[PDB]
Design a binder for this molecule. Structure first.
Ligand SMILES: COC[C@H](NC(=O)[C@H](CC(=O)N1CCCCC1)NC(=O)CCc1ccccc1)C(=O)NCc1cccc2ccccc12
Ligand SMILES: COC[C@H](NC(=O)[C@H](CC(=O)N1CCCCC1)NC(=O)CCc1ccccc1)C(=O)NCc1cccc2ccccc12
Ligand SMILES: COC[C@H](NC(=O)[C@H](CC(=O)N1CCCCC1)NC(=O)CCc1ccccc1)C(=O)NCc1cccc2ccccc12
Ligand SMILES: COC[C@H](NC(=O)[C@H](CC(=O)N1CCCCC1)NC(=O)CCc1ccccc1)C(=O)NCc1cccc2ccccc12
Lengths: 217, 222, 223, 219, 223, 218, 222, 217
């Protein structure tokens, strides 16, 4: 018992420590997701629901499984009740439950770390919410930023002494890429998305190609 | 049966008669058909008694269940959806005589304007629903008499008291033209039940006030 | 009930009446029957109210579900196929009176030319579908009156505003000959709902525009 | 089995000890729940039924599973019979059974500790009831207070002397936060506070948050 | 069949006739239709004999089952809910001719006022239920006649004894106008069965008491 | 836990290391698949969908199972929605999920390595896509070429030095067979197919026998 | 609806009208009823539109599925069997009004004589099948008129072009005596669709050729 | 994991080595099957379909299970599609799949080795096809001959030196029995069958008793 859980926890922690890093931090316009991602077509950040976004670090197929499960849960809940009853707290909670069960009962635990973010509805005034769920179902509610994957300590430290509330989009992005460096980081190695509190319905929006290159310089 | 609901400035009111029948025979005089399902919602149901009461109970339990599980109550749209799904679920048994139609009256705390935060939703047997943007609605065997009465009396609704009067009077007309709807029984002192909902929540109107309104209506008609 | 949809240069328009009936009795005056199912598609549905609304809702959820899962929205043909499969799935209940027919109007961003990139698809109760190459289509108890009106009025459609006019007028003729379709209620200010879709997406036509057009029709038929 | 069950019991016990502490104590107005909780929205204290509340310490997803299961049980029993038939003794019993089965048969035991509290119905004279359920299904009936999670000995000692079953809400709260402080080394941002208010008409559970809680804290 | 129940100051009374019929043929003279289901509740049931007895037996078993499992009896509302759920469960067989309607009389030990702690609840075939405040209630083929008799005789109910007499008299009128209800058989000495419930519990009324009241009624109607 | 996973990963890696090599590289006309295959009827390269091709290295029954499963997925999806909704990214994603499940839960992990390639539809100008899925469900998307099976490093380097974008079919073939040698082939030891972006619907086509000999002479 | 298919020396042709009806009402003018199911096979379907289109699409998907799984296309008998099994599977819904009959035309590359490689297979609602040895076959509400016309006109078929004209003329007679089959619409420029299959595969006949052939027929009948 | 699979492969390999030998070789008239078989009624060579035959070496009940499963597969395909759609490549492929599953998942791996042979249909010129499926699902496409069971090396080499692509039936049989030796086997220790490409429909026919004795002399 003790050694089985020890071994599972260690496999998962090593798996996450070996993967690329992702950071999500709240800024004046909503929530910003920046992830080291060389792929053209594979995504570590995704939309969950109207005002709820998703970021992950670790083994792709596994956190993608979790992503699809989250989208399925959210869409089903919005159908059964209403789109306004779907909240970031709910998705984070279900991710905690699911990752707990996976970690305890699956053949191999999931080498993943998750962040569920929620911005306010259009016109509503509500401070963003950031949630971090780890491989064993542990859940934490962060107020400013979330770092997942790889060697986090230098990135978390970089953010701790360089982050300010309500930063501009360019400022928040530059701070994010800066914190990522501590551990080239141009448009070709980045995946950037944002939950934009200023959009009427679907807040998730990607910043790619020429636009992202413009935002970096 | 007749259940009425109307919006007044800053609130909503719902009232229902007290009569239970089996065919032509009267099998109940004190029956209650309007229930407070939530802190800010009330439901009145018409049709088969068993199905109506079980609808009210199960629905209230469902709302409070979601509230305790997720730590926040459902949005009003969610409540509408759950009631609709319940009716649609009952369609099969309804076709065999276990029919029940609900009428939902609530106060949306998330609405932009607290003076128009009242909500009235009517349903059909297939779980179709309608949010009334016209001020009043009714359900049951006398609901057409009540709607046609409120069509004339609604311009008088300016506060909670005038709205309650118009509601009780609509029930009076319904009972006047429908034998399945019960009017005020002055001999037994049995009057329609009413619930009023504003920002302070949903509360049942005491019977004394409704009786006062009933006697005002009767005297006005003589 | 009558739902109309027509193609105009570079876009599509869809409009629907506001009347809900139970047999002969009027049970609704402000009902909405045209919904924006996605950024570039709108669906108008006729039949049993419950089944119609459930179709629109579940359909929108399905499209957005595929979009979020696979990172790209469905091809227009895919959307058509899913709606058809949904109707075909409802056929059994339709035989017992829970019938619902949809009409789909969209803007195909993958079309070879933003002229004629609008799409109009009609369905039958078995989920048969047809992509209309003749510019307009209608569904509901007044669909024949509206289609016959558009048969004469379609030549006048040159842009979005003229198409919106012809749509509202076809609805007016439908309500003129069919008691289950509601016309403009000038006393209450309740008018048909409309959605127009072009390369910039799908937008709701404000009630004001539809009202002005309705009074234009009325005064044209009066004096 | 001599060592498998020992390992399970140890895993659960260690799991509970490594987590923050929760206190529930009876006061003049009902029952008070105070839990060290940095989260803004993740709850360790919850309503179970009209007069029954729930507090937990340990791994979140697990005691949240148990919380949801308890709400399911309570609502189901109230529907099948009547709301007045749902009692704290019942919820404590089903929690004992459930945690026993989990502890013996689940892949991993639950690192949780539970408290089920019940106050009297409106207008009825009856002393509050506190039940304590541990990771192995052991159930105990506590008379004054329950402490769960972390190092419980300093908190239990702090409460045991200088305790008032008829304390005011503010007094009972400040004694509770004091006992929580004796197991440290707080304020509105580090506390989750709720109450089973015996003076409320139907649903006795209510939360004490933000400025109101600050009022109870600072004087 | 006729089952009566009426409230008296501080208690409740329930009585039932003894006749079993198959169509016009009398198949029973000593049948017992009122049962003590628990220390403070009794149920009298009308309809198909098999289903009626199964209802009484199964119901008593359910109540005592809950009592032993949870160490406390059900609240009266809980008892009502369980009986109603039982009837609703039988609805299907009732539609096929196995109908049985119960009438419940109890004493609520948790009630606020002990003089008005009597409870009488009636049910319909779908398990609809009503807690009667009228004061009295009846079920069965003679229930109309018995209820109409109690409507005139109820003002005379001042204690348990006057309530018992009014009950037996209502059964007498029921048998007077309904051939499916059996009256007092003075040749065989078979009289209605009665149960009375107060704060001390539910007890069977002895045959000598009911027999005396019956003979008093007969002599009063015979002059 | 860690020992079972070490053994599974080790078994799969050795099994793949013992099998023949396959190369897939993008050229001016689409994508080219070249695989060492002496057999005359057993396949390592196959069509998946209109513009999507499949190549595999390792144990035959296993990557053939995966091949059939991919064809099933593609045909089922194309039927449920439309043929234009089936993409190479989708198939690569599903192969990653499936091989993850196999690696974690089946009695023995699959000793296979997969490549899913996609070319543009007829008349569209879209860069080819190459996807590589490994025995444990790890997925990567390469822009130029993918090498699988056997000793890959010499072939990967050989291509790294000798590969040029938008090469002719013959040029890409010569470069591919050259890189395969460093780890004399010809028609009797090769299985060659191409995703031909210039074909109206079905882009997959095999190059066998006399035609392949013609391209090899150059 | 009418679908025709006939053999010519070294190939086969299939043609179909463009009309869709709901009872008496015309609900379609440009409908396509003949489809290329694979490189050497084409299918034309008559009956309920939804079921017909699902048949054609699903059938092509099945054939290509087998081709990709097993690396070789089905034998022609295999294609016949699968189509028949599909029809037999639909028998239940066909009894309920969702009837669809297919007509299959192909060129068998495994056939002995590259001129006798043409194949025409007709089906019934139970999935009965017939490989036609007499050269032509038709399906739909106008199939008896089209077959009786081809009975007289088939002797004129000597190559891949005379066969097309006999097909188009048979469709013309079908539309002449059957209102459910649509004839050439010279006002709108809508003509029947045709597919021709020989050793080089299955190709769509271009519209302009069908237009000229139809005009020749019309002016011949005037 | 690795240990278990090694043990399985060894059990199956030893089982096949301890068993009698079988040879299948293409000759001018089709395909020839020759097997050392002392029994009178237990058969190691069998018909699968019209032009497809089956030969096996190893544990009888196991390769007999596979023989029956192959017959079921072939008949089912021929019914669902057509008799002409059943091919030797298909049967070999399905045998590879099946033995893979058995080898990895069955309680004990099957100690068997399989040969699937196909000749052309009547009136067609298609060179015979020989397929070899081993206990772990490995499948190979042999061009001339296949040897299974026992110590194969001497027989495989003997056939490599003595094989003639278009030999007569008597010639090919003599070569097969010659390679099988390298007690004094004869028409009492042999089971011989042929896929005779000159039969109209069912090509499988056995060569037994007096006719076989004629073939050896
Ligand atoms: C359908 O319109 C007539 C309906 N009547 C009924 O439902 C009456 C009510 C009745 O006799 N009792 C109430 C319960 C205690 C005994 C007396 N049962 C029936 O008509 C029998 C139903 C049935 C029989 C056989 C097979 C299937 C179904 C009615 O009054 N409906 C009004 C109504 C609405 C909301 C809550 C209510 C609660 C109690 C009573 C009525 C209520
Ligand atoms: C001609 O077709 C008649 C149809 N009528 C209906 O659907 C009406 C609608 C209605 O009474 N209400 C709307 C929602 C609740 C309040 C009142 N129900 C019914 O006719 C009852 C159906 C039923 C079926 C089987 C057994 C029993 C009953 C209709 O008007 N359909 C029009 C329509 C189309 C799209 C969206 C809509 C949304 C709301 C209302 C109507 C809508
Ligand atoms: C329907 O109203 C007449 C009813 N009669 C019946 O239920 C009688 C009872 C009877 O004949 N016997 C009792 C048992 C021993 C033999 C004599 N069965 C019947 O009439 C036939 C039942 C049936 C018909 C068709 C299909 C299935 C079943 C009755 O008297 N009901 C009164 C009654 C109430 C509570 C407990 C009782 C116990 C015994 C007898 C009667 C009881
Ligand atoms: C003999 O029967 C006439 C048949 N017509 C039909 O099947 C028409 C066609 C039609 O109105 N639309 C096409 C689809 C989009 C809307 C417009 N629907 C119907 O007859 C409705 C069937 C139904 C009714 C009630 C319950 C369940 C099912 C027909 O034309 N059949 C010919 C035909 C063959 C192959 C492909 C086709 C594709 C489209 C249209 C026709 C096609």
């Amino acid at each position: 018992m003790e050694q089985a859980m020890r071994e599972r926890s260690e496999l998962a922690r090593k798996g996450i420590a070996r993967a690329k890093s992702v950071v999500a931090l709240a800024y004046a316009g909503g929530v910003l997701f920046v992830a080291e991602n060389p792929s053209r077509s594979l995504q570590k950040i995704s939309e969950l629901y109207d005002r709820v976004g998703f970021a992950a670090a670790g083994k792709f197929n596994e956190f993608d499984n979790l992503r699809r499960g989250g989208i399925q849960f959210a869409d089903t809940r919005g159908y059964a009740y209403d789109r306004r009853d779907v909240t970031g707290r709910q998705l984070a909670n279900v991710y905690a439950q699911t990752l707990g069960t996976i970690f305890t009962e699956q053949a191999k635990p999931y080498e993943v770390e998750l962040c569920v973010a929620e911005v306010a509805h259009y016109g509503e005034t509500k401070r963003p919410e950031l949630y971090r769920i780890t491989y064993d179902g542990s859940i934490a509610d962060e107020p400013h930023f979330v770092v997942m994957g790889g060697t986090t300590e230098p990135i978390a430290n970089a953010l701790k002494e360089s982050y300010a509330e309500n930063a501009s989009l360019t400022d928040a992005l530059r701070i994010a890429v800066a914190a990522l460096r501590a551990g080239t980081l141009g448009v070709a190695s980045l995946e950037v998305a944002v939950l934009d509190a200023n959009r009427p319905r679907r807040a998730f929006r990607r910043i790619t190609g020429s636009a992202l290159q413009a935002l970096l310089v | 049966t007749t259940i009425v609901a109307l919006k007044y400035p800053g609130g909503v009111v719902m009232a229902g008669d007290r009569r239970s029948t089996q065919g032509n025979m009267i099998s109940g005089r004190d029956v209650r058909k309007v229930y407070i399902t939530d802190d800010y919602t009330a439901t009145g149901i018409a049709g088969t008694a068993a199905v109506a009461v079980e609808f009210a109970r199960l629905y209230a339990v469902e709302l409070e269940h979601y509230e305790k599980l997720e730590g926040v109550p459902l949005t009003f749209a969610g409540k509408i959806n759950r009631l609709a799904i319940m009716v649609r679920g009952n369609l099969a048994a309804a076709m065999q005589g276990l029919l029940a139609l609900p009428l939902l009256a609530g106060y949306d705390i998330h609405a932009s304007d607290p003076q128009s935060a009242g909500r009235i939703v009517s349903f059909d047997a297939a779980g179709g629903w309608n949010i009334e943007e016209e001020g009043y609605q009714a359900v049951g065997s006398g609901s057409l008499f009540a709607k046609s009465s409120m069509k004339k009396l609604y311009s008088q609704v300016t506060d909670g008291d005038s709205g309650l009067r118009v509601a009780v009077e609509a029930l009076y007309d319904a009972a006047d033209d429908d034998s399945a709807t019960g009017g005020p029984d002055l001999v037994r002192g049995i009057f329609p039940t009413a619930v009023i909902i504003d920002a302070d929540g949903a509360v049942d109107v005491p019977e004394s006030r409704i009786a006062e309104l009933a006697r005002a209506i009767i005297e006005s008609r003589s």
